Write a protein that binds this ligand. Structure first.
Ligand code: N81
Ligand code: NI
Ligand code: ZN
Length: 350
């Protein structure tokens, strides 16, 4: 029944009306009822009515505390990205560096051309990424799809323990320029993410279906054996870049999509994704959960080498939503197997 919908696990695009846009968890349950999650990634275009902020002229003086210079080493479609932290700078400062002739977007015809240039010049002229900036660009009273307060069950983490994990249950802002990259990864604890591109040049995405995620890992282990030996989940370091031709070459299924200013992307539990920014832009993101995520959370394979320290205690979730399995789970005898094609239970309404 669920296998029926989006059997090609292709990236789907949604155009919710305002009535649908109002309830966040509801619409997530909906797009999953349509099989959107099978691609690991979905685009959601909000109603033209809606805007999260009246004007982005207010922000040239906002500080980016920890700009990141992205050095990329590799060849033949395989790369490792090293971060070099630069001194703080303002949005105005960043935009100036971004739009400069040294760092700006090259001229091109079709998207495929910008993409080939990206994979050709990835290792040259290392760009700067205004990344992991704590903050939101939502106006205080915007009640729809507010990344600052989506009100999903991920809230049980702060609610129960007071713990906040930056960018995960709090928002992050990402200022990009041409050729700035995000490496292949799933979210921490294999959560969902929501990504809103406030303004600027597009952000292009690659994605691998969760049902084929393990195959991408096998490949990654094979190409980076030293990293594989030192960490059980080295892709969580977010340093590993792998071109579409390489995936194609080794039969890893994947899809592409380009995100325009004013568009949302949703990534789904155990959805590997990666991509790059086209030029100067600004994106806001955080993680979130649904009931379906819980099993992913329980089974998430985490970074063992301490480079990624994000760890959420699953105990509250299993107690509250899997009471019949708590004893079993707590005693390590819970061998539930995950079906990546099933939608979250909240979609029973649909
Ligand atoms: O850019 C990154 O380093 C992570 C990325 C982002 O937040 O832009 C993430 O893929 C996501 O959107 O969930
Ligand atoms: Ni991500
Ligand atoms: Zn690690």
């Amino acid at each position: 029944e669920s296998e029926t919908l989006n059997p090609s696990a292709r990236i789907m695009t949604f155009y919710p009306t305002m009535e649908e846009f109002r309830n966040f968890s509801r619409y997530i349950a909906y797009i999953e009822s349509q099989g959107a999650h099978r691609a690991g990634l979905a685009k959601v275009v909000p109603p033209k009515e809606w805007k999260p902020r009246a004007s982005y002229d207010d922000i040239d003086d906002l500080v980016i505390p920890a700009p990141i210079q992205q050095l990329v080493t590799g060849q033949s479609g395989l790369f490792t990205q090293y971060n070099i932290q630069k001194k703080a700078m303002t949005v105005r400062e960043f935009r100036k560096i971004a739009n400069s002739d040294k760092y700006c977007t090259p001229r091109y015809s079709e998207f495929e051309e910008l993409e080939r240039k990206y994979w050709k010049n990835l290792t040259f002229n290392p760009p700067i990424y205004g990344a992991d900036v704590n903050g939101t660009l939502y106006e205080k009273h915007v009640d729809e799809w507010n990344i600052g307060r989506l009100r999903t069950i991920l809230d049980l983490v702060e609610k129960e323990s007071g713990i906040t994990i930056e960018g995960v249950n709090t928002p992050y802002l990402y200022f990009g320029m041409w050729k700035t990259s995000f490496a292949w990864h799933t979210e921490d604890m294999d959560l969902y993410s929501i990504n809103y591109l406030h303004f600027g040049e597009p952000k292009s995405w690659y994605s691998v279906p969760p049902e084929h995620g393990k195959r991408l890992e096998r490949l990654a282990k094979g190409f980076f054996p030293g990293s594989a030996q030192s960490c059980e989940a080295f892709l969580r370091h977010k340093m590993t870049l792998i071109s579409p031709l390489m995936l194609k070459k080794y039969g890893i299924p994947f899809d592409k999509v380009t995100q325009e200013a004013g568009e949302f992307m949703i990534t789904f539990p155990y959805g590997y994704h990666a991509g790059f920014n086209h030029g100067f832009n600004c994106a806001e993101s955080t993680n979130f959960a649904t009931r379906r995520w819980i099993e992913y959370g329980k089974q998430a394979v985490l970074c063992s080498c301490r480079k990624d320290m994000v760890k959420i205690s699953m105990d509250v979730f299993v107690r509250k939503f899997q009471p019949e399995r708590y004893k079993l789970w707590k005693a390590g005898k819970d061998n539930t197997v995950i079906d990546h094609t099933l939608p979250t239970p909240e979609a029973a309404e649909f």
